[PDB]
């Protein structure tokens, strides 16, 4: 089954300068699309996932606040674990998981749910 | 056939159509005269760098749309960009000179 | 994202390791399926439908 | 302050040769191997010409390796694989190089044309080949032996050379000789010696090769350039992402050429490296240098050698000056277009409902061209939560979205525009109007300016985004604002073809119809009494009119009176606003005089008035239009009664003049042109028959028995009112059509003697067709030339920009009526209208200004000085305005779409050239070629001669193939002695005294003369009347204007005569030098000032010379532009057009003009 | 140009060695080298050199494949 | 709308002079640092911006005269802030 791996690497790139059509400029090259850019319908809606999320996490306590953003790399660098944010809190362990359930339960009943919902699809 | 903001050429950054939504139409060396013989610029600025050719000038121009707020933050062509490296990767030395 | 992981979270969706590629018809263009064929490769067990 | 050291907004361009250090500079990392990726992880192979640690990472903000993956990591380098870790954008940025063995020769410096180290070195190009092949040697630094500095030697004599002296006696061969000669040449001592010769030696042989060369030098030496660097020690990598690999479906990979190049580059030079150290034979290492050199040829300009070919692919590999160069002839993606995001395009059509200021557009296009205007006023109101929803509210077409639509619309201009973009009026904006439908509705009086047909022609679209460019449309490129033409002020807006039959139509009066004689109030009771089937459209009636003059100051004055008229003049003159005559709307109006109604109407009351007095002259034309149901049948097109009649005597003559050929009376040749000269006058004849009957045969009675008025004839309304049709097309309707022509040019004696009312038989038609097809392809390649045309019309104008005020030089040209011969080919009125005077002008008695020195002459002027007889007038042109680097306004002229003065920074060069090509489609020695004949400045073929200087002449020496004139002045010295072939029959008369300049001869004189013994004025005004007697018979409209611009640029350098300055036969600006001597009559030398003498450069010779080297660099040769500029360190400021917007910086004029303006001050500041 | 053929012609100066030729040089060859070697085994610190190497290859620092390729035989 | 911006090139004389200015005045209408001089009718800011052009309450020297007041305007208020940057010294 290898033939086909095989029979694939051995085929020489193209000249990206292959004339096509019309003999005109067209060329190969000039029909490639970038794929690593990122539309700007989707770069708006990331600056305003943000706006979003921290518009709606200014809206809870500020330890639901905190906890959340902890728990989540939320503009910080990586994101903790329960255990280390018991610790940061002195109240620790399963308490801390409950207090996520209630944040995320408290987001979730519209008030606060109609806008964050508009963001998936 | 219209196009608003589609996909875009790899080499050079510039509008290309790769879905069958259009690229944009192509605004040649003639209809550039065009806008020279009116006095405006500002049309013309913003026809070859933030409505096409720039790649960060494209992205903040639409976050701005959006804002509604009407501006162009233009930076440089990237057209040119390209020749710039394609000169300097022969021998010559090109520099950007001044303020 | 952090963002993200956290909307995930909210309403509960799980992120598929799956991409959606599927074939739908062009913008404003509407008609009338008349027909569909199925090729496959040698080898590949063909599907319920083909 | 702190100057500065970061990323400011810079000024200029610097360019120029690269050290091999300097090129270091900008390497980040050597590039050692030729692998790419690795082949099964299709990651890049380190040292590479793709590799992750010289150039970047493959994805963002992740490590190669992939230890560090994330985002907070960015200054990071890799401890396992050094990678920073930053946006895979910088793979598009970071450059390489490469450390060559032996070192290599830069193709550019060696083969572009004049080969520049050739003439650095002063040595010729094939033997410094000979040195590069290894084919033989050079010296270098001979020391006092036997043997010159850059002597070449061969094998034995290098030998028997070496035998004599061993050392103060020097040679290399190859690449490193050349480099050492470069590094071992002394310029300035050169430049020394050089002097002195100059000073010594007395030869213009000798001292014209000397002068030129020393120039070079000490540019170069001023450059800053190391002549060594012509030779590269190391060669830079261009990015990777600029000569991808991306893969493709299926697996398949592509990349570009370059890769295939710079490969081998490494491969053979690295081959080298091992080379020495096996210590391998020199005819080895030899042949590897030669390789090594022609990989890097063919890497950076291939075909200048063999054209290396790409692999597997015979199709030869592109180099980086390939890559430059782009195609097209000279286009740099800035030059052949650009595709632009919003922007659309599709099929358009009438609408003839619209105002002019507006357009039809799909509602679709609408909804995707502004998309993200639409997500921002969705989310501004609070109907879209996030951006997101807005868009799936689009996206699923919600109703509310449309409504939404409609205020994004309203104040936000379009661009429209179509194919063939010729003047400016090719784009135009208007304010969007939804409709259902994929099609562009487009106004109809705008359809002439476009050459917009309806038969399918597409139009594209494009929405103006920044606010600024909003506000540039709406005061620009708005329909209403222009107009009219900028060719000729004559409005461009003027109906076309049905609203000008309507009027027609309208104002027209047969002899009897209902409601003749009877009389009414006014206008409105007129439409009352037409409408109610009571009174006949035309027909003679007397009616009350209130007309108005505002005569007064700034004030309307009333009358009423009873006008003799028809009913449709009263209908109409219900539109005609305020201030005009109902005189104007008394007469038939046909589309001539509907023009200069509109012309009239805007001359006087303004703007405003005559936009909307033009919406309703459109909407009453179609609308009565409508009514008349005029048609066409095929009993409209009336044949004379008398044809065959005519046929049949010409046909006489023919076999009569047959006869006199049957006996010998006339000659064959003879005889050809009699038949076709019966034959033409037949045709004119018949012509002028069916026009008789045709047009007034319509024969009518009032009461008695008969009369006879203009017919009523569908067909001929058309073809009177100029609407469409004309007398010729209609005599090849009825009458008989032409005398075809064989292929070859002779004109067929046998006429076609159908036409198409009757059928044509099968030779006729067949006759017919070569004339068809000899016409489309004649106005397809017509129309290519006018193309080519404009292209170097606006490269020699481009850049010119009214800037100063008011130059304030008296000097201008005299003009006067053409006056052909006959009487008056075209008027002073004309001539006039919208210039500045130079001088007060008289009456015929004096010490009475009428127009008082330089005032603008609008119509009321030219009217005071049609009132009086004055025959001659001085006004200021371009050519003569005084201002340096631009024009005064004061000089140019009014003209505009708008009838204000040229306001300060309008580019006018751009549409004097856009002016001119636009209407060449339309011309045809004599045509368009002869147009150009006078742009380039085309000496004759066989041309006249003008007396060099005045005072009497006569013949000297004898024949010897020419015949010696010589000159005797009255006062002045004889020696001026031409040599004139003495076998062309002369003119001049030997005994009479000849004024400089005077008809020496007869037939053409080449403007160089003309400039050089007539002067300044003369060959402008020569080349004004030439060229325009081309267009005028042509029959068009061009102002004086735009071509006295171009030949101000064609004049745009002189050469200087005397000195005190700078050197002496420098070709040189105008503007420049007479800034010089008019700084030096001050200050400086007492006057050191040089005189200098006005040149005639054809237009695409004096477009070659252009300060900025990027413009240069658009349309000339590359290769060339960028050598020669990149020796001297040329410093381009930017400062004109086209390098501006190659750049993509706003253009120094119009809006830009402001900012350029407050920007170059800054610089040249502190 | 084309450097195919200015090399083509720049070997296409030597002529072909004769059978005879061939071993001339050949022994010429062994002459030089053969120098080199007595002239290598006439230097001490060489000697020493090899000694204080081998005792390290039997003290287990090196490898016998990383000092000699055989000896005569 | 504005049909035709003939009165405004009458107010300043050039008409590209007249784009710059009116453009700037949109922009202080745009965002949203003022309000308009004139009844906005539902005119985009484009047009309002040129209505007060031909109504001759908004041009260049006017603009120029009423930032220079805002610049102190603010230097007023943030008065003693900035004095109390003197841990310069
Ligand atoms: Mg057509
Ligand atoms: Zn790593
Ligand atoms: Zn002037």
Known sequence: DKIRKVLKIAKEPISMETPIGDDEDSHLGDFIEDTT???????????????????????????????????????????????????????????????????????????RSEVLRSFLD | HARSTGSYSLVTQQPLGGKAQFGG???????????????????????????????????????????????????????????????????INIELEDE | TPEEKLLRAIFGEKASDVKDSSLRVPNGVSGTVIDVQVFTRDGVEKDKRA | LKAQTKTEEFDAIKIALASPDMIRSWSFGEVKKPETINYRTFKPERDGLFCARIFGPVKDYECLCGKYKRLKHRGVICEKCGVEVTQTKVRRERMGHIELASPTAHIWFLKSLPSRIGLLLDMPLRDIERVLYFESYVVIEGGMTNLERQQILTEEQYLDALEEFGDEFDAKMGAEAIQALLKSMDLEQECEQ????????????????????????????????????????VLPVLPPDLRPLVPLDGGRFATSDLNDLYRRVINRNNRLKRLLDLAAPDIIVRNEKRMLQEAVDALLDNGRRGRAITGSNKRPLK??????????????????????????????????????????????????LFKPFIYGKLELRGLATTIKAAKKMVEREEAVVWDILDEVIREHPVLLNRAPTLHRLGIQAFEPVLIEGKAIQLHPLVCAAYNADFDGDQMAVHVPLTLEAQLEARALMMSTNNILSPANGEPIIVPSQDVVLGLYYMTRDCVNAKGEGMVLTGPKEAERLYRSGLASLHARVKVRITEYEKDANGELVAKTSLKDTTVGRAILWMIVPKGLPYSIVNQALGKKAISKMLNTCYRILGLKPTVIFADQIMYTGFAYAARSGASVGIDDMVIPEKKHEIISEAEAEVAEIQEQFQSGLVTAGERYNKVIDIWAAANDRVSKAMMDNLQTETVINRDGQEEKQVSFNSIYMMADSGARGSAAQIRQLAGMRGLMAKPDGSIIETPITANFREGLNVLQYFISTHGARKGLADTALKTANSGYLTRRLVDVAQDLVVTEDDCGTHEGIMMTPVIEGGDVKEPLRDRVLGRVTAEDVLKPGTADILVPRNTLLH?????????????????????????????????????????????????????????????????????????????????????????????????????????????????????????????????????????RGDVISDGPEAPHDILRLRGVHAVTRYIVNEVQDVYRLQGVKINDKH?????????????????????????EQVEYSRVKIANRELEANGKVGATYSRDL??????????????????????????????????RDELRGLKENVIVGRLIPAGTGYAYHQDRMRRRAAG | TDPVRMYMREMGTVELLTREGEIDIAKRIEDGINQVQCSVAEYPEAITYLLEQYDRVEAEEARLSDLITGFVD | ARVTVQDAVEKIGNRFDLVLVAARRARQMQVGGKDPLVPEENDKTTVIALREIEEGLINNQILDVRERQEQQEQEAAELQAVTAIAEGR
Not at chain 2, 79 to 88: A, G, H, Q, T
Not at chain 4, 204 to 223: D, G, P, Y
């Open chain 1, 37 to 111: 850019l990122e539309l700007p319908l989707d770069s708006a809606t990331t600056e305003s996932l943000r706006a979003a999320t921290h518009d709606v996490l200014a809206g809870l306590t500020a330890r639901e606040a905190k906890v959340l953003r902890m728990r989540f790399g939320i503009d910080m660098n990586t994101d903790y674990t329960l255990e280390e944010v018991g610790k940061q809190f002195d109240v620790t362990r399963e308490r801390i998981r409950q207090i996520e359930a209630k944040a995320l339960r408290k987001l979730r009943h519209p008030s």
């Open chain 2, 25 to 91: 139409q192509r605004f040649g060396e003639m209809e550039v005269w065009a806008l020279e013989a009116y006095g405006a610029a500002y049309t013309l600025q913003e026809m070859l760098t933030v409505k096409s050719d720039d790649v960060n000038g494209r992205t903040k121009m639409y976050k701005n749309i959006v804002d509604g707020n009407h501006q162009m933050e233009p930076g440089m062509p990237e057209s040119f960009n390209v020749l710039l490296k394609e000169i300097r990767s022969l021998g």
């Open chain 4, 194 to 233: 050089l002097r002195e010769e100059l000073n010594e030696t007395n030869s213009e042989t000798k001292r014209k090769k000397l002068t030129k060369r020393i120039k070079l030098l000490e540019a170069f030496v001023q450059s800053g350039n190391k002549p060594e660097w012509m030779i590269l020690t």
């Open chain 4, 319 to 368: 180099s980086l000056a390939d890559m430059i160069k782009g195609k097209q002839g000279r286009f740099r993606q800035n030059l052949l277009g650009k595709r632009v995001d919003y922007s659309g395009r599709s099929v358009i059509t009438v609408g003839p409902y619209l105002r002019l200021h507006q357009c039809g557009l799909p509602k679709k296009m609408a909804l995707e």
């Open chain 4, 859 to 995: 119509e009321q002027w030219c009217d005071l000085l049609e009132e009086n007889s004055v025959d001659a007038v001085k006004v200021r042109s371009v050519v003569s305005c005084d201002t340096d680097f631009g024009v005064c306004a004061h000089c140019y002229g009014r003209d505009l779409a708008r009838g204000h003065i040229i306001n300060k920074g309008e580019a006018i060069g751009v549409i004097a050239a856009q002016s001119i090509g636009e209407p060449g489609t339309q011309l045809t020695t004599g045509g368009l070629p002869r147009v150009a004949d006078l742009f380039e400045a085309r000496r004759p073929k066989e041309p006249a001669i003008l007396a060099e200087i005045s005072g009497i002449v006569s013949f000297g020496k004898e024949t010897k193939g020419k015949r010696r004139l010589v000159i005797t002045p009255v006062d002045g010295s004889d020696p001026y002695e031409e040599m004139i072939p003495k076998w062309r029959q002369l003119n001049v008369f030997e005994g009479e005294r000849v004024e």
């Open chain 4, 1043 to 1067: 071509i006295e611009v171009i030949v101000r640029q064609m004049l745009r350098k002189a050469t200087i005569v005397n000195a005190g300055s700078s050197d002496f036969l420098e070709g």
């Open chain 4, 1097 to 1130: 450069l054809g237009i695409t010779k004096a477009s070659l010379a252009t300060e900025s080297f990027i413009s240069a660099a658009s349309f000339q040769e590359t290769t060339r532009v960028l050598t020669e500029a990149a020796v001297a360190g040329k």
